[PDB]
Amino acid sequence: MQTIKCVVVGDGAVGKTCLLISYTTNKFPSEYVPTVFDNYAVTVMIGGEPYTLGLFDTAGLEDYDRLRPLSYPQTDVFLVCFSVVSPSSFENVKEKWVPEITHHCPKTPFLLVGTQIDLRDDPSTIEKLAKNKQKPITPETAEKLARDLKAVKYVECSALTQKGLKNVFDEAILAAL
Amino acid sequence: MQTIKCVVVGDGAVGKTCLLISYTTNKFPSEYVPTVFDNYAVTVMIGGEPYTLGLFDTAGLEDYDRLRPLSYPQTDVFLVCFSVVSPSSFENVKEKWVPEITHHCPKTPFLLVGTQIDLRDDPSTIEKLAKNKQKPITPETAEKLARDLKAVKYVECSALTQKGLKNVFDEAILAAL
Amino acid sequence: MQTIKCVVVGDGAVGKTCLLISYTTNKFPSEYVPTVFDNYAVTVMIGGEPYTLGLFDTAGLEDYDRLRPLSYPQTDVFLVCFSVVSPSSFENVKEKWVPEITHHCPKTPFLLVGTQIDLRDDPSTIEKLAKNKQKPITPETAEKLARDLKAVKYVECSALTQKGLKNVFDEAILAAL
Amino acid sequence: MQTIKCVVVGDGAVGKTCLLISYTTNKFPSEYVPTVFDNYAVTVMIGGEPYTLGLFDTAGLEDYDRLRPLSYPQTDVFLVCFSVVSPSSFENVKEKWVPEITHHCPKTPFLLVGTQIDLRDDPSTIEKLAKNKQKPITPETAEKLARDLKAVKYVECSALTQKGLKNVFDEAILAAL
Amino acid sequence: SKERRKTLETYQQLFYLLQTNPLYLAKLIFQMPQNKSTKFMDTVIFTLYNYASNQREEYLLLKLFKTALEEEIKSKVDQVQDIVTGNPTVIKMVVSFNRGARGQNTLRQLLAPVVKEIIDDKSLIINTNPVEVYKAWVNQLETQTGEASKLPYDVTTEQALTYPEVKNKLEASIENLRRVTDKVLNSIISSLDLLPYGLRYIAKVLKNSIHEKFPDATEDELLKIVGNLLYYRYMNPAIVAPDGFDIIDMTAGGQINSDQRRNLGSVAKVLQHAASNKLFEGENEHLSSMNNYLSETYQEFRKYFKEACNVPEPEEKFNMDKYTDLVTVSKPVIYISIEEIISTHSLLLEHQDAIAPEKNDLLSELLGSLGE
Amino acid sequence: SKERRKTLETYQQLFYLLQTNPLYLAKLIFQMPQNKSTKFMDTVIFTLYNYASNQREEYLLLKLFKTALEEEIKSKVDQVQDIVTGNPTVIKMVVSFNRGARGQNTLRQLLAPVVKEIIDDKSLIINTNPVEVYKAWVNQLETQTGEASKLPYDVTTEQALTYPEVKNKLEASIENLRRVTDKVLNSIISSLDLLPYGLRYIAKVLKNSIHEKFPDATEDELLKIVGNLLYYRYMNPAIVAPDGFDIIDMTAGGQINSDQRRNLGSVAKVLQHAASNKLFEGENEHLSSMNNYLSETYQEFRKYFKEACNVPEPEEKFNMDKYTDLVTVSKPVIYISIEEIISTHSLLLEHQDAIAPEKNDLLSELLGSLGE
Ligand SMILES: Nc1nc2c(ncn2[C@@H]2O[C@H](COP(=O)(O)OP(=O)(O)OP(=O)(O)O)[C@@H](O)[C@H]2O)c(=O)[nH]1
Ligand SMILES: Nc1nc2c(ncn2[C@@H]2O[C@H](COP(=O)(O)OP(=O)(O)OP(=O)(O)O)[C@@H](O)[C@H]2O)c(=O)[nH]1
Numbered sequence A, B, C, D: 001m002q003t004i005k006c007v008v009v010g011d012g013a014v015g016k017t018c019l020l021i022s023y024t025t026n027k028f029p030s031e032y033v034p035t036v037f038d039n040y041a042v043t044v045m046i047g048g049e050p051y052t053l054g055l056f057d058t059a060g061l062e063d064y065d066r067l068r069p070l071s072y073p074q075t076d077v078f079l080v081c082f083s084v085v086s087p088s089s090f091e092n093v094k095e096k097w098v099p100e101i102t103h104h105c106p107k108t109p110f111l112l113v114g115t116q117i118d119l120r121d122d123p124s125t126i127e128k129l130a131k132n133k134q135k136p137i138t139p140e141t142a143e144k145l146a147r148d149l150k151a152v153k154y155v156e157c158s159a160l161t162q163k164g165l166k167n168v169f170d171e172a173i174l175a176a177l
Numbered sequence E, F: 001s002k003e004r005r006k007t008l009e010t011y012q013q014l015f016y017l018l019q020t021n022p023l024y025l026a027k028l029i030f031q032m033p034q035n036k037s038t039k040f041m042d043t044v045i046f047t048l049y050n051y052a053s054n055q056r057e058e059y060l061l062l063k064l065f066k067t068a069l070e071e072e073i074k075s076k077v078d079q080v081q082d083i084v085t086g087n088p089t090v091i092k093m094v095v096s097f098n099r100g101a102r103g104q105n106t107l108r109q110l111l112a113p114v115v116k117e118i119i120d121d122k123s124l125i126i127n128t129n130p131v132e133v134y135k136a137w138v139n140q141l142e143t144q145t146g147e148a149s150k151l152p153y154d155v156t157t158e159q160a161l162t163y164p165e166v167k168n169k170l171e172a173s174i175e176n177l178r179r180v181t182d183k184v185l186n187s188i189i190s191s192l193d194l195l196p197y198g199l200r201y202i203a204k205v206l207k208n209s210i211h212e213k214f215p216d217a218t219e220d221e222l223l224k225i226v227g228n229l230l231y232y233r234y235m236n237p238a239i240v241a242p243d244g245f246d247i248i249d250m251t252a253g254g255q256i257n258s259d260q261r262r263n264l265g266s267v268a269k270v271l272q273h274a275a276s277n278k279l280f281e282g283e284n285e286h287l288s289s290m291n292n293y294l295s296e297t298y299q300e301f302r303k304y305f306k307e308a309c310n311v312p313e314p315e316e317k318f319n320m321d322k323y324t325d326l327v328t329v330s331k332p333v334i335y336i337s338i339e340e341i342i343s344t345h346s347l348l349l350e351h352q353d354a355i356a357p358e359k360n361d362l363l364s365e366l367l368g369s370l371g372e
């Protein structure tokens, strides 16, 4: 039974664990705890074949930088995540994440993934961003970054509502071929 | 006339250079000298047609990764190699090689190539693989990997006995055609 | 019973743990283990009074940057250490250590402490330093840095031979009054 | 004539301001208003000699540490104060104050000054310190700290009943002489 | 390992709580004796910045802050003014967390301009202290005059004003000060909407709590407490120490001059009085001319403070329903821990040449995987 | 679960050895199947850099390297050449550790100057491949003349040399190549004394070990093995990829051009051949003019490699007696690990209103006492 290794990396608190748990249990983590590392497994069949989709969650906090690379071997596809409602996380995609995964896995394809899209229309987050003279990252801006950084493509979702959630992993699986 | 670019890659010491020499010069290199980069030229008939096969020999060691791609531009077919009496080399086919050439040449065909098959039927060698609890790779084990990695078709040979040698490049051209 | 709190900080592997252990038990650590945190206590009487000298070992490695400051409150004197046969540790005295302790304890005095002075005449370390176009830090140079960084003064020693070892703490005590 | 620079420092809300007002204007400030920096002038006879005592009132809260030293240049005597019905304040004498003034003014003399002594002999207050398991500081407890910190001599008072107030500044001038 | 076991457990608990339950760590920090909570402040605040980076967790921090402040009020507050004299550690953490949360540029993105204006004026020298001004005059200007200082060196306050010259520098300083101060005050008063929701909300909880316990407290008294939080505690320290609270980036060179300090410090004094509705007098009589300004500034501050509390409940402010109506899961938490090694008795170490520490060599086969 | 623990426990062991016993971790790495040891190489080496920063520790690492290399030889090496074809992981670690240890600037402080020279020459374009040159000639330079490539776009080696013009570019390239190569070679050969002691020592161990097992091996064969370690494995990669092995600072801009790659790569090819005493011929006949240089260069390399092994044993190199004649002790060890939380249900917690949590008090006293 062929396996597909998918690793999720990105700034701390951007929603990496939530999207993984939401996608594999259809539930939402009841609280936040910065992860160290963890890995789940789920079976899918986009090609009549029973593949084992290995999902690897990593730490986003820099405090855990030394440990993070341990999850990178034999990775088939990377999911570089950022919060569409958190600009700083978007910038670190090119300032930290892509550089890191391309340093450890130059040949491995990755997707740029926007998370927390359900907060784009949330009053308080919009107001919060405006007080700082900012606005949610737009699909167009991210899709550009994806092209510049040579990502397979961009995709976004909401672990909360699951809007786009499945498509994210369908693509990941597609890119892992 | 008609030239086919065929690049040979794979773990160091698996025999990439020896197969290229005993094939084009029907001579088996005594001692071992790892290569940096070399080129061979041999015109062979395929389908009653004269073809000039360009053979790009490369370095297997990881410390030469930045250099290897210099041989990849505009390649017709890739010959991913491994020693049938060295599991280690076989593991790297789907671990490093197939992933690398797939990054640089997405739509380029390649074949899987077992080598040193003459040592597979050798006691003093098998007893060495036993003292480490290992078993010579088998045509079946390989052929499975070929189909899994979406190769063109597994093939094997011996640079020493030249057994199956000639057939390798024939399938290579056919794949490039 | 009046107490005196002395905290030792400095680059990893420069000799902080060894000078503390050698001074308090006249034994020498058999192996090297980066410390996380540690604190011993010893009694002395330079003024006919039985004072409790509290000695706190800290982690030199940056990984413990967030944990180390927890040893800083109520410090009477700091010992900023660097290896006289390690120029890079000497430079971090002004790039990292003095800034850190003065950020947490602006009013607390500190001495600059050179360590491993017995290696100043060790052939292999002199040679090693020469291949890198370097030489052991000289007392004069260190004394200058102490003046510029406003240290109480400079002192050096060897935890191995104990040459200067006691004077280091005698001055620390003196400075902690 | 003759002027003496006396700087009053210590934890906020201990009553540093009140003692300075009910002394120079024999009036006890109704409400509480934390100060930034103030100045008072009072000429008093000491040894049959007219002296002008300059009173520098400062901020107690830690967030005003950068500012407080502005009052330290050329001070004759420091008045470290604390509330006898607040252990918290007492702990900070040897924890913050004494250490700060000793950094900026190494060879300057200071006295320890207890305050709000009128509340010590108060039930409703002692029952509060009890519900937190605490006991009002005692003249003995204090005087010990005085000698330990190398003060000039402990003294106490009450801004409300003015009890012992006058004696404070008398010992102060005496100390500056 | 008597004393040593303690220390070990302390760090063990501390870093366990920091990673997995900072809200609870915070709670423990609040109930510790106040002097002792000081050493944990920075490290917990730092972790809360990351923890509270999403609204659901910021919501929980707000609730923690709220119940702790109310817990403090109805438990240690007996005559109002106690929430101020008592120096509750909850307020200290609320104040700090709001300084450098992650809307970050809040105080510097509000006071930097006007503060940078006071620091840059290489000529400004405000000094509301006669004796100091007096001594600063000929007592320091007779330098390029000779005769040293034939005048009475070191004089009182009442007589420093004998010299009209000295009464003039003060006159100007009083003018300067009021000009500079008004600049600051306008930056503040006009930017109420730039204040952090969280800070505003606690100011509300604060007020609504003291008032619930002390109904006999007037709008005036309440707003003076609310002003203590927002002005004297929150932003006044940034005005006096812009270098300490990072309002103005400090490029390696030199720190604030005594003149710059005295300047900024004077503005803070003026504004403190205004917010606390305290006119200058008795000993501060020479500044009485400002009492008119102080009373107008107070009326502005008062309006400001009252409006600060005008804000929704976190449940409403963040649509918490997107969270409370969810089907959650609580998978087991993995965290980074500190461990100690038992330590083999010397008796067995003296003979490790014959005995020999146990070792798992079939471990490199286990190690040879991790993540498949 | 019973599965995540076996794993969690394998991770805790990794963390423990990394901080407490890297020497043993390294050993475990040597015995793992080779493909599997790759994922621990960087992280262990990184740790060894700090661990072996002092001579006593570097001494132990050297002894670890030694016994492991001899372990490898008398156990997996049957016909010499096996220490090379077998790609022993001890050699992989020996090489990496010596690249970025503590004398850091060693290869960059030895190759950077001449490499920086070959990179900077915006006109240098070495290409020892006839068909590639041919196709590059009018088969490409005619993009500024039109009439396209009226010639056989894509020919063979032999006939690519039919065009005296193409034979000329090659001629020059061979001149350029020999010139840049000699610059590289001289930097290396004249700087044998700048090589790291540890690297020279292992080359010595390596040589004396193969010789001990294969007495019939000649000085020439032995030195080719030693040259494999010092040249093909240690520095040749830094010449070919100075950007990868940090020989030249890469300021945010652009990476090496294909032309710079082909240039550095060509030097590496000529030097490999020389170090391995292999003359150009059969298919590489067009470069045969260099065979005279190759044979002189080999003689220089051969002399270099032999001298490389000319070094004392570590016991003597570092006066290790200063650490044996000494009273030692072993204090308790603390370390950083991973741990999973059981997650149990608390009976009392729901009743803190009635029972006052004795946990909050203990935990607060504990935390409160941290330090002194
Ligand atoms: N509204 C909304 N909030 C989300 C969403 N995903 C995550 N969050 C919030 O963000 C918080 C943190 O998300 P996590 O996935 O745990 O953070 P992470 O990416 O794992 O970060 P680290 O583990 O520290 O690297 C969650 O607890 C939620 O409060 C989302 O899709 N919608
Ligand atoms: N017995 C036997 N040995 C072989 C065979 N092919 C190669 N070898 C040996 O394997 C060792 C290395 O052969 P090479 O061809 O130089 O290896 P390579 O693939 O060029 O390795 P690199 O140049 O380092 O990437 C030498 O001993 C070769 O003689 C074979 O078919 N049979």
Ligand SMILES: Nc1nc2c(ncn2[C@@H]2O[C@H](COP(=O)(O)OP(=O)(O)OP(=O)(O)O)[C@@H](O)[C@H]2O)c(=O)[nH]1
Binding pocket: C010, C011, C012, C013, C014, C015, C016, C017, C018, C019, C029, C031, C032, C033, C034, C035, C058, C059, C060, C061, C115, C116, C117, C118, C119, C157, C158, C159, C160, C161, F054, F055, F056, F057
């Ligand atoms: N020759 C010599 N070697 C020393 C001396 N002091 C320390 N060393 C060597 O340096 C090694 C590490 O010293 P430690 O004191 O353990 O390092 P540290 O300063 O505690 O570093 P961390 O605990 O990681 O922050 C010791 O194990 C010895 O090998 C010395 O005075 N002379």
Ligand SMILES: Nc1nc2c(ncn2[C@@H]2O[C@H](COP(=O)(O)OP(=O)(O)OP(=O)(O)O)[C@@H](O)[C@H]2O)c(=O)[nH]1
Binding pocket: D010, D011, D012, D013, D014, D015, D016, D017, D018, D019, D029, D030, D031, D032, D033, D034, D035, D058, D059, D060, D061, D115, D116, D117, D118, D119, D158, D159, D160, D161, E085
């Ligand atoms: N009952 C009583 N209260 C006092 C006494 N002295 C001061 N207080 C009260 O303590 C509180 C603060 O007094 P302040 O003098 O302002 O305290 P402080 O030391 O000036 O504090 P800062 O100026 O903020 O550093 C007010 O309620 C004062 O009335 C006293 O002797 N008896």
Ligand SMILES: [Mg+2]
Binding pocket: A016, A017, A034, A035, A057, A058, A059, A060
């Ligand atoms: Mg995560």
Ligand SMILES: [Mg+2]
Binding pocket: B016, B017, B034, B035, B057, B058, B059, B060
């Ligand atoms: Mg080869």
Ligand SMILES: [Mg+2]
Binding pocket: C016, C017, C034, C035, C057, C058, C059, C060
């Ligand atoms: Mg240490």
Ligand SMILES: [Mg+2]
Binding pocket: D016, D017, D034, D035, D036, D057, D058, D059, D060
């Ligand atoms: Mg005051």
